Symmetry: C3
Subunit: 504 residues, 3 copies
């Protein structure tokens, strides 16, 4: 069965089908970019197709087994995997899962997706992904620590951990304290002469070189991606909406890190979050749900169920089919497939999760003509941008703003004082020129996270605009996914084009 | 005899007694910061006390002997020492003395103090200290050079010199030309493949990678530390003073680098420096002494004695007991002890020297209730901040401001021109909008030292405010030393907490 | 025959004669800068003369031969050379020529010139130069690629290629695609563990780490060098000219990269380019030639001959003797010699080429009293400044402005909004305060090249002013070349002075 008609396809097959759509569009452009007076047009097309043939498969996978000592004294053997999809830029970049679902095929497929997401936000890393096949809840903190230090050593001995070769990150089942342990193990062993050891991994605690602004970054990028598309009347009218985020109604599938922080930013932006659907229960409220109260309730009772500021909802798994302006898939992959795509009524889908829409569903919804999907490899890449800033920070050996906050603040005050002196000379009375309420608040709370926030907002706007320009140039309509892959493929291809692919 | 009643205690014992006072205050906070669902409160308190037990002793000392050839042809054996107190962050940092008083115990005690001073100004280095046991005046420039190159090689072979491991600095009996020699020896030998060789040491001549603004930096930090405390009415009233530095009278013990530059900044700030006490003579003048004339006189005659702009003073060693608002100990250690603390009449003591106040004297003066001591590990750490900027500069391989002075100047002129255009449109006449006299002077003299000055001022204000907040939170009164150690201990402890102390 | 009377002297002899003139002027200053209480004035003068004796000769030359396989299957032996003139700062810096005229003597002489040009624009590299003895037009792209990868490996094995040791650049017969190949070969072989591999060479394609603003940089520096001298009335009056570039007539010898970009900047500055003289034809027009049309015509027909916007000129090789305010030699070396210096009527000569004026001609024109030569080692060093920025960029691992364009733009808008609020409060009506037309255009097109442009303009003004100050201090008149060598010698000497030259 062709991919556009399958029901539960493999994740790696989805990535490659979407890759092919983008490659077909951008191929003539790639041929034109190959400047060579020695090659005919036929020769150029054969080399371009060779380059694309090398990009799609994963370059490298390392598989390891190793014993650990349980706390009571018996020993167990643990499996782990680390995939490096592309080395066209080094180091490679990607997270590490502790989960019973990790396997070779899964670290392969998500490492491919990660190469394209790095290219999408102009982050100079090839894609990587890793995993340890354990249920982290069945282990004590002491056992988790021994497992974590051992994967650091074994990965680093073979070139799958280090600031210049491969730089990991947190994922499901790991967090910042595991990242601190890996950084400490690397610095004391394999990396003991490395001047930049703390740059071997990102997601670290602040005290160990982590960066302010990381926790909310993926959510802040989902908000900024919607804002780039909500300001465009040509697209908002085709789908039956008015410009802007204030007033729009939002249903969110998932209340993890990504769902909760996206709710905070969309609420602050003036949107109405009318529905939260979880794995065992759903809630709703057509007037909107207040983020701080909902998070507080779940924090105390253990669930979003019976939230006083909303009502529980009928067969909880069907909330995502209700009418809304924006649906945010923020849970598991393939949550939208062939058998339920038609039941979707949202006008905008913002993929805050890895591949939540299969190619069959993506096609059913493109044919319906009234639904704009903002692709995952762009819109949930905010955290990838800020992990690039954390690596930079560890290479700079100083926090952002340490040598500029006071210098720039004093220049700004001398600027306003110069304006005040000239104004008073001109109108001949006293006339204070001070920072207004908003400017005084920024000046007073100036910190590293503001530089990080501005860096992320800059990248998402630039990349979002480039997707739109590509979609208009090739008459792609509302198919922004194909436009995003074409921009991503084009960047990777140009590395191979200038590095030299003549050898083989 | 308990430490609060001894008369001449060892310097290392003073540092550890002050360490214990701070540790006692902050210990409950450290327990609360240990997030672990696996440990009971009892377990956390036992691990916290283990961490503090490892922080206090010096981790490493290297001792060396080596021959040198005198100029006439005979040979002599020279001793030297280098201590690394803490490696919780690398490289370690600290100066090198050429003096007949260097010994193992002295490089040990001052290396401990140096760990806490680095933490106090948020500088990411463990503490180190070094020394060569010679009287530098008895040697020719050729012999000093041979000794200096030899300690470079021997220290660097064992990991006690290098940009990522241990970064020295000038001290008594050494200066910038010895630092240039060490940097050149390292780059041509042990460090011949090191891309960042010039970052192995700080205090270098400008042409070799030194930084503008280093000479006056420790004095500029003493001034900024007094200014943080002089603006606080709650404390100025408890000691019988009015806010601010203009008008306050100042007596300074010592006319070396630190005393002279502190006099320059305090005079420029509007204070009256009524007394200078040296090792063999003192002078005074209740109207104030002009810094540039005094420095000129000593430069020509060889001493501050018989300065025309002041009178010589009765038993010169007793000037520091005269009434004043501010006393600045800037000479030897333990200048204030049990037998002379009561004779001190100053309301503020700004410790511009390493441990000038013993624990007995510190306690006699805390009980008198009317005397505010600003602790040495904070207030004479301005030079430590700027040595961190010099290391950064050598890692960046470019001077600060090289790629921004003209870009930012042109943006500021386009900003003022935009304001001028809008003002003239609004009021309908010609109305120049130019930088005022102060802003035009800064724009015209913009240079690396202005970035350095602002960086230092930023750090001293932030750290000074954090000392005050900690002193108010734990009801410490005027005991700012204990508050400063508690902030310093807390930073070091959090490195150990996240790095992992489970092994042992 | 003395150098000031020779007719066709060797290029290395010209550089050393000019070196001696500068050394003679600055020698007393160098003696005074040697602070040492151990040496007499006689001793200092002997050591200074030793240092200058070591600076002039080339420190190192590497010569290599190697086989290559032609495309048809036969083999050929190729020669190449790489000279490192000075290692007082590392890495060394300089381009690589593919040309049948490369030889040991030529890479030696231009490597010496390159040390002095780096010092002239405050760029911290010793001088290097390289070459491959081939006619690049006789080879296919495949053969050029094999030659290029082989010189990368062989140079890098011996320390003549690498980010910390020696950093090359394009020159006659090479361009950005060869630079990409060298960077890729180094990163995959000798440099496979080097975290900063892409910094081994400059002139790279953008996608591989090249820098925006490189193509026009040497021309932009010729324009800025003329502007520094055209604003000075003392000199413009001695040569019979009025201040400024608007209105001045310009004849340019050469229409390569340097000549064409200089024409663009001088035209945009308001100058009239009345003549272009090439190797086989010349054109002229006393009303001026439009750059974009001329470049278009040559692009289509293959030559500047029969340009519709001008007339062809009588014995084409004599256009450079016609009256003009500014002559720009931008072709081959020694284009002005003893037998044709008198025929030169230009009031300003801006040497946009390596040594276009021999010492005999330089002296004939200094005696005529009415001709100001702006020396090549200063005025055609704009590209050297920007190659330093490209190396910095590869060490920073991020493009300039990536983490500041949006942060600074938002601060500027909050600044203007604060001014608007205060203005409206003061005059009691609505009064917009917006960026004017020029400021809005800069804000909207803000990019890396603007930082690069400002960096270059800053350096050329500072170095141009230092040449003028030195020429006035030693009564050098219009002899700016001697003043420029003296500033360059002084910088190199101070490295040797502080590094230590006592050994030998």
């Amino acid at each position: 069965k062709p991919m556009e008609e399958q029901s539960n396809p493999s994740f790696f097959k989805m990535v490659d089908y979407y890759f092919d759509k983008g490659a077909t569009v951008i191929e003539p452009k790639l041929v034109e970019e190959m400047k060579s007076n020695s090659m005919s047009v036929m020769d150029k097309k054969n080399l371009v197709s060779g380059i694309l043939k090398a990009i799609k498969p994963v370059n490298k996978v390392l598989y390891i087994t190793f014993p650990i000592r349980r706390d009571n004294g018996e020993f167990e053997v643990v499996e782990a995997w680390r995939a490096q999809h592309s080395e066209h830029r080094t180091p490679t970049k990607g997270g590490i899962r502790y989960s019973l679902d990790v396997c070779e095929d899964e670290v392969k497929a998500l490492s491919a997706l990660m190469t394209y997401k790095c290219a999408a936000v102009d982050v100079p890393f090839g894609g990587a992904k890793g995993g340890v096949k354990i249920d982290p809840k069945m282990y004590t903190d002491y056992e988790i620590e021994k497992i974590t230090r051992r994967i650091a050593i074994e990965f680093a001995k073979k070139g799958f951990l280090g600031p210049g070769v491969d730089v990991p990150a947190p994922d499901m089942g790991t967090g910042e304290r595991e990242m601190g342990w890996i950084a400490d193990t690397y610095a004391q062993t394999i990396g003991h002469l490395d001047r930049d050891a703390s740059a071997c991994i990102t997601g670290k605690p602040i005290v160990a070189g982590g960066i302010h602004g990381r926790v909310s970054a993926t959510g802040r990028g989902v908000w900024k991606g919607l804002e780039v598309f909500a300001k465009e009347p040509e697209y908002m009218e085709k789908i039956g909406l008015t410009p802007g985020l204030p007033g729009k109604t939002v249903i969110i599938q998932g209340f993890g890190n990504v769902g909760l922080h996206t709710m905070r930013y969309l609420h602050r932006a003036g949107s109405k979050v009318v529905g939260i659907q979880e794995w065992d229960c759903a809630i709703h409220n057509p007037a909107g749900i207040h983020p701080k109260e909902l998070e507080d309730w779940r924090d105390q009772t253990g669930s979003i169920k019976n939230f006083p500021g909303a009502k529980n909802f009928e067969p909880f798994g069907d909330l995502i089919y209700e009418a809304c302006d924006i649906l945010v898939p923020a849970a598991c992959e393939k949550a939208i497939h062939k058998e339920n795509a038609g039941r979707i009524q949202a006008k905008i889908i913002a993929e805050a999760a890895n591949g939540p829409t299969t190619p069959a569903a993506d096609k059913i919804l493109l044919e319906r003509g009234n639904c704009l999907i903002i692709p995952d490899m762009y819109v949930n890449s905010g955290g990838v941008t800020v992990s690039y800033f954390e690596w930079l920070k560890n290479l700079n050996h100083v926090s952002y703003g340490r040598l500029s906050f006071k210098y720039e603040e004093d220049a700004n005050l001398m600027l306003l004082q110069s304006v005040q002196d000239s104004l008073e000379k001109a109108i001949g009375k006293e006339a204070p020129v001070r920072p207004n309420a908003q400017f005084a608040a920024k000046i007073a709370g100036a910190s590293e996270k503001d530089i990080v926030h501005s860096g992320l907002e800059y990248t998402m706007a630039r990349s979002g605009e480039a997707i739109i320009r590509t979609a208009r140039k090739y008459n792609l309509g509302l198919d922004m996914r194909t436009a995003a892959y074409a921009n991503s493929i084009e960047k990777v291809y140009n590395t191979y084009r200038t590095a030299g692919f003549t050898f083989t």
